[PDB]
């Protein structure tokens, strides 16, 4: 090892005496050991792109070869940690140096080698067992929520020569040692994986289970699945935090991985303040979400090669926790700020531009990234199954979905929750547009619904029809004068507003509307569409009978039924049980049926 | 320290453009500082730009005129650009390279700081809370600025953004609830009339003791324009995070900085980027705009106010477009309001402050701030629409409630926006003017003010 | 069936030899074992983008939007391996599948593809948003070998005239539909409403088919005539008279 510096011109260092140095390997330049990466070889010389500031590097300085590309450390110490695109432990730099800056050429391990971890081996394993790549051979009790499963790296195999008893070990002790063909491998609690390589699985399964968020919209009208791909608009004043807060607090996920890819300086200071404050309830107790969450945090002035490799660090962490058997949901905030760092890294290398200056390989990257999500059957013996759900965020200039990044990401992803600012200014929350949003996972969730909530899909189609009809009846009510209104259309324009105001609108600052279970959702939609059906038939039967019914009689014969409909969304799911709310909704149904028979 | 003697080289091997290529340099160090002595005796200064083996490429600040390859000497300093910094720099005028141009001595140093600086740890920065009071009601009252924000001013050529910058500089301070404050001013690429105006206006309005002025002129070396904002921000960081003051940093015409960046890029033989400017201009602007904010454990802040001129009045030119991706909000200096003889010509409809919600409220300015601002914005937009309809419908066929939205317009532009270049209005005077304007409409038309506040502040 | 699957997380530079492996297999099965092969090449856009990436890697002359200047001569070595030969009883029918960026048909990929292939089938977004299947827009569609494959003894004597008349009527209907968006519903003539009726009945009866329905070509021609009987036989100015005398009254 130990080449030397031959020339420096900007961020580009040239190193001599680097004979056996691989491409895209990482190196440390100078006496402060700045981190850089090899981008070209020529004879005995290597061309290095340095990530930090090269100001002060002289000729003859050392160059240390690391031997591996950009990789991540995977072991106990990830939950509640705060990293960046290079996986530097920000909250440990902050406390070991006692300065408010990130030092230049700082070399600290991502997982601390001081904590003693509680490790218990697999009770069936003994000297002579046949263990392959992926097998869980121990468990570290990370915290009260997450059990950390110790797995063999995906490429090893052999017979157990030694396995450690239960006890306390740090992430440097040899906990396993196996043998193959006369060669020994020692393995500790931490394994290293390159971030640009997909982790192996046994098979990629189709996604057929819902991702419960807790909002009535996004769970009825635009469903996502466990293993899916979503995209939202990341803009100012659109009410965007509902998505990440719902995912973190009330969701069926086990592990959460949040990624900022070059956010503003004060926008990161808000996430790093809010996220350690959210809480969940588990087994009756209240715990912090940072017991099952990891954050990757970059700002606009951090190295451009960390604002680009952030997405890969995040997806590798989530693929590491998917291989244990968990269901992970990753969230990448402002994927556009990643695409811009991509374009800038290209520009530095003097590469031919493509449409709008972005590199040639933009759609290839954006597609091979989202192809890393999904449900899988995990490699290894104890027969588990995991999942990774990716939620990206795009920032189109002025709400224009023609930028190359927005066009590509809308071509790829299957769901699209369209947050709107217009609805936010009207105090309509969650401000989802319901007219430009979509979801193409609705045919995969068909055995699930038909097995668990049989009478739901018809209600979904009916509600979508009603909400579309109230909208394409707009010029009819403006260019004409609200009077030439067939009674079917009066019934629509009233019940659709009932839906818009008492189903699609939810308020998190309450004790009853933070979380809406799905039985409550299907009940609240069934009562509304059943009303609609009965009130529509009552009118269109007595069409020519000299007893013309109009909405004016329907709104006077049932003046409390309508209130109780508009009051369905106050039934607490905790202070009232599930059978109680079911019986209340059934009573309201029978009262509706009565008060509709006592009208004919 | 550095106790080894320095080396002088008489081995110039090439001269072209602003670059001198020297050979037989012992261990050339990148970005080093060099002192050249010309054949007759004049002394110039330079910086190492490229290094290769035993060969250095020095960029000379004052040009390469009269330099030959047989009698010019180059003495190598041994280190990089470190500037001296102390608290006595408040009340002084330096040029772009940091030497005194106000008939005073050199800075006696409290420390020597590297002007490139290190990035702030994203985990130590905290959220901006209180208010920075500029004394201009168009900004204070409706586009409030928080302690730690970064909010630019967008203007064009001929518009009066330098006088707005000067008024902000000589009025800004902290809100007087019921003062550790300093200003660092960086003027880049200004002509001589602008520089004269700044210098004299600051030093004769009795305020040049909480100001540090860095003046860079259009005929100065174009490398000094690259290091001017980094000296300004190094001084600001010293003041705010070691002496615990509240610093406001004003940087005038970042477009000239971008032009100097383009020049020193093309000197490296780099192929141009989109529309002229280098491909790495985002990172270079971000290493400037992100040297700001509040931090944990210190009682000081840094607030930044970049000022730009939009070429061709375009909002999608690379410089405004990239400054929008790093900063939080914008102020707009308008040309229709300038031609109508309104000062300051600030258009409040396109302007925005992304962190106003944090700067205003109870205990910071007053409990009625947000509602007064919302109602003034609403009434102004409605009055503009009414003045549009008046031109086709006729002024004799307007309602009585549309005749109120047309008196509010005149009174708002002539009494609230239009201020006066030497008139200092505290936040409370601004809000009282807002209420004097809102009392044109009956209490029942002010829809955006909650009734619990229309009871305390309307009847006066 | 013989599948050659290169997915989105696979080597990019190996997308350059996948269609050539497929087509070598096809040529062996067709011109030596004498079978009738049907080749489906999915997302020639990804092939073209891998080609652009390899071209930019070694700094070659670009064409429009950065694609190499030899993209025509490269796509033509793939598309031109399809046809029949003299003395052998096989064939190769190619059906590439494209995705046009931003629905633009002037992009280099569709534009260079349309100069090489013998027609194209245009899949429209405006018809997808109306829940129409198959969402095929017949005006930007074309097949260059139709004139020699239809007619007497091949399908039926009237095929070509019905096709041309349906084209003319569809174009005039789409003109009227855009005139009425400016001049309003009540400024149209008695014939513009005939065209606006033809448009609806055509888009809902002829195009819209259902995803498992197999219409013999005579059923298609009967539907076409049922659509052409909306107009008096003097508006059908592309059909000769001796065809209207035999096929229009029925």
């Amino acid at each position: 090892t130990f080449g030397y510096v031959h020339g420096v011109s900007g961020p580009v260092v040239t190193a001599c005496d680097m004979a056996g140095a691989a491409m895209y390997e990482l190196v440390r330049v100078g006496h402060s050991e700045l981190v850089g990466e090899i981008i070209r070889l020529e004879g005995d010389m290597a061309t290095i792109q340095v990530y930090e500031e090269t100001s002060g590097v002289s000729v003859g300085d050392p160059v240390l070869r690391t031997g591996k590309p950009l990789s991540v450390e995977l072991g106990p110490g990830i939950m509640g940690a705060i990293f960046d695109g290079i996986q530097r432990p920000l909250s440990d730099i902050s406390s070991q140096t006692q300065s408010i800056y990130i030092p230049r050429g700082v070399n600290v391990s991502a997982l601390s080698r001081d904590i003693k971890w509680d490790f218990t081996p697999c009770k069936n394993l003994r000297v002579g067992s046949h263990i392959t790549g992926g097998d869980i051979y121990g468990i570290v009790s990370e915290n009260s929520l997450i059990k950390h499963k110790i797995m063999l790296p995906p490429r090893n195999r052999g017979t157990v020569t030694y396995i450690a008893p239960p006890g306390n070990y740090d992430t440097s002790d040899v906990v396993l040692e196996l043998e193959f063909e006369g060669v020994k491998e020692k393995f500790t609690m931490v394994q290293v994986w390159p971030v640009r390589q997909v982790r192996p699985v046994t098979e990629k399964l189709p996604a057929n289970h819902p991702l419960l968020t807790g909002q009535r919209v996004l769970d009825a009208l635009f469903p996502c699945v466990q293993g899916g791909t979503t995209a939202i608009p990341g803009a100012f004043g659109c009410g965007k935090t509902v998505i990440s807060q719902s995912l973190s607090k009330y969701s069926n996920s086990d592990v959460i991985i949040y990624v900022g890819c070059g956010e503003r300086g004060n926008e990161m200071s808000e996430v790093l303040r809010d996220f350690p404050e959210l809480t969940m309830e588990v087994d009756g107790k209240v715990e912090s979400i940072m017991k099952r969450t990891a954050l990757v945090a970059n700002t606009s002035n951090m190295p451009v090669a960390a604002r680009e490799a952030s997405i890969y660090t995040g997806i590798t962490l989530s693929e590491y926790f998917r291989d244990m058997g968990y269901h992970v949901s990753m969230m990448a905030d402002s994927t556009s700020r990643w695409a811009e760092a991509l374009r800038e890294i290209s520009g530095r290398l003097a590469e031919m531009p493509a449409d709008s200056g972005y590199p040639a390989y933009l759609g290839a990257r954006l597609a091979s990234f989202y192809e890393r999500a999904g449900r899988v059957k995990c490699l290894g013996n104890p027969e588990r199954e995991g999942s990774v759900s990716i939620v990206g965020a795009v920032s189109p200039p002025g709400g224009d979905f023609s930028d190359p990044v927005t066009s590509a990401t809308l071509g790829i992803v299957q769901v699209f929750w369209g947050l709107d600012k217009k609805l936010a200014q009207r105090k309509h929350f969650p401000s989802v547009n319901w007219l430009i949003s979509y979801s193409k996972y609705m045919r995969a969730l068909d055995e699930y619904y038909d097995k668990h909530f049989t009478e739901f899909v018809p209600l979904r189609t009916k509600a979508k029809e009603i909400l579309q009809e109230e909208e394409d009846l707009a010029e009819i009510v403006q260019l004409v004068g609200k009077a030439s209104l067939a009674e079917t259309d009066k019934i629509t324009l009233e019940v659709a507003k009932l839906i818009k105001d008492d189903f699609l609108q939810q308020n998190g600052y309450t004790p009853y509307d933070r979380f809406c279970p799905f039985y409550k959702t299907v009940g609240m939609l069934s009562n509304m569409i059943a009303f609609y059906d009965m009130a529509r038939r009552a009118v269109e039967t007595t069409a020519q009978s000299d007893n013309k019914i109009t909405w004016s009689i329907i709104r006077e014969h049932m003046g409390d039924i309508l209130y109780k409909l508009s009051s369905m969304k106050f039934k607490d799911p905790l202070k009232d049980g599930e059978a109680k709310i079911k019986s209340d909704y059934a009573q309201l149904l029978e009262d509706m049926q009565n008060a509709f028979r006592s009208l004919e | 320290y550095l106790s080894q003697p320095r080396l002088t080289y008489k081995t110039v091997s090439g001269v072209n453009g602003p670059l001198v290529i020297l050979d037989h340099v012992k261990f050339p160090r990148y970005a080093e500082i060099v002192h050249l002595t010309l054949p007759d005796g004049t002394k110039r200064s330079g910086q190492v730009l490229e290094v290769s083996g035993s060969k250095a490429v020095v960029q000379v600040f004052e040009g390469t005129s009269g330099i030959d390859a047989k009698k010019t000497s180059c003495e190598f300093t041994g280190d990089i650009l470190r500037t001296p910094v102390s608290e006595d720099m408040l009340g002084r005028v330096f040029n772009g390279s940091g030497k005194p141009i106000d008939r005073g001595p050199v800075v006696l140093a409290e420390d020597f700081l590297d002007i490139m600086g290190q990035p702030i740890n994203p985990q130590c920065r905290i959220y901006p809370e209180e208010m920075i009071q500029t004394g201009i009601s168009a900004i204070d009252g409706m586009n409030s600025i928080a302690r730690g924000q970064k909010i630019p001013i967008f203007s064009a050529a001929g518009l009066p953004h330098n006088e707005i910058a000067a008024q902000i500089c000589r009025q800004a301070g902290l809100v007087k609830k019921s003062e550790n404050f300093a200003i660092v001013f960086a003027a880049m690429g200004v002509n001589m009339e602008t520089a004269r105006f700044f210098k004299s206006d600051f030093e004769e309005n009795g305020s040049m003791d909480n100001v540090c002025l860095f003046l860079n002129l259009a005929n100065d070396p174009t490398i000094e324009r690259i290091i001017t904002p980094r000296l300004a921000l190094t001084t600001a960081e010293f003041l705010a995070y070691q002496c615990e003051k509240h610093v406001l940093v004003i940087l005038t015409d970042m477009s000239s900085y971008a032009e100097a960046l383009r020049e020193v890029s093309a000197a490296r033989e780099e192929v141009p980027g989109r529309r002229g400017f280098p491909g790495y201009m985002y990172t270079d602007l971000a290493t400037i705009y992100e040297r700001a904010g509040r931090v944990e454990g210190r009682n000081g802040s840094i607030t930044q106010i970049p000022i730009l001129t939009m070429p061709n009045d375009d909002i999608t030119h690379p410089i405004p477009d990239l400054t929008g991706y790093i900063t939080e909000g914008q102020i707009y200096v308008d040309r229709q309001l300038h031609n109508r003889q309104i000062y300051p010509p600030i258009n409040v409809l396109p302007s925005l402050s992304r962190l106003m919600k944090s700067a205003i409220g109870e205990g910071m300015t007053r409990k009625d701030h947000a509602d007064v601002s919302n109602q003034l914005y609403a009434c102004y937009a409605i009055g503009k629409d009414v003045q549009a309809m008046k031109a086709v419908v006729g002024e004799e066929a307007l309602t009585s409630d549309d005749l109120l939205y047309l008196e509010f317009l005149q009174k708002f532009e002539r009494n609230f926006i239009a201020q006066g270049p030497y008139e200092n209005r505290t936040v409370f005077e601004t809000l009282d003017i807002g209420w004097q304007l809102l009392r044109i409409f009956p209490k029942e038309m002010l829809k955006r003010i909650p009734q619990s506040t229309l009871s305390e502040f309307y009847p006066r | 069936v013989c599948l050659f699957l290169n997915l989105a997380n696979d080597p990019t530079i190996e997308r350059i030899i996948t269609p050539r492996l497929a087509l070598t297999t096809a040529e062996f099965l067709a011109y030596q074992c004498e079978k009738h092969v049907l080749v489906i090449l999915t997302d020639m856009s990804s092939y073209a983008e891998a080609l652009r990436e390899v071209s930019a890697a070694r700094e070659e002359v670009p064409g429009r939007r950065g694609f190499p200047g030899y993209m025509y001569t490269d796509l033509a070595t793939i598309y031109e391996r399809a046809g029949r030969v003299e003395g052998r009883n096989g064939s190769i029918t190619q059906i590439p599948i494209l995705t046009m960026p931003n629905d633009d048909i002037t992009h280099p990929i569709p534009d260079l593809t349309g100069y090489i292939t013998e027609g194209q089938i245009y899949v429209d977004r405006q018809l997808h948003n109306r829940q129409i299947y198959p969402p095929i827009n017949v005006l930007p569609s074309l097949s260059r070998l139709m004139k020699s494959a239809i007619g007497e003894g091949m399908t039926r004597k009237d095929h070509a005239d019905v096709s041309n008349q349906l084209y003319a009527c569809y174009a005039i209907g789409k003109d009227v539909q855009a005139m009425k968006a400016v001049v309003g519903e009540e400024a149209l003539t008695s014939d513009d409403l005939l065209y606006l009726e033809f448009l609806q009945k055509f888009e809902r009866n002829f195009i819209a088919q259902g995803p498992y329905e197999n219409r013999t070509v005579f059923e298609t021609l009967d539907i076409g005539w049922q659509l052409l009987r909306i107009f008096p036989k003097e508006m059908l100015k592309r059909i000769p008279q001796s065809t209207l005398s035999e096929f229009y009254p029925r």
């Binding site: 003097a350 031919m352 531009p353 | 033989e269 192929v271 141009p272 | 700094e59 002359v61 670009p62």
Partner: peptide, 18 residues
């Protein structure tokens, strides 16, 4: 862009082969 990259490539070919 392509023309300027060609000029620079020819520069860095000449200076190295000479």
């Amino acid at each position: 862009f392509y023309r300027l990259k060609k000029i620079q490539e020819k520069k860095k070919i000449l200076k190295e082969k000479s």
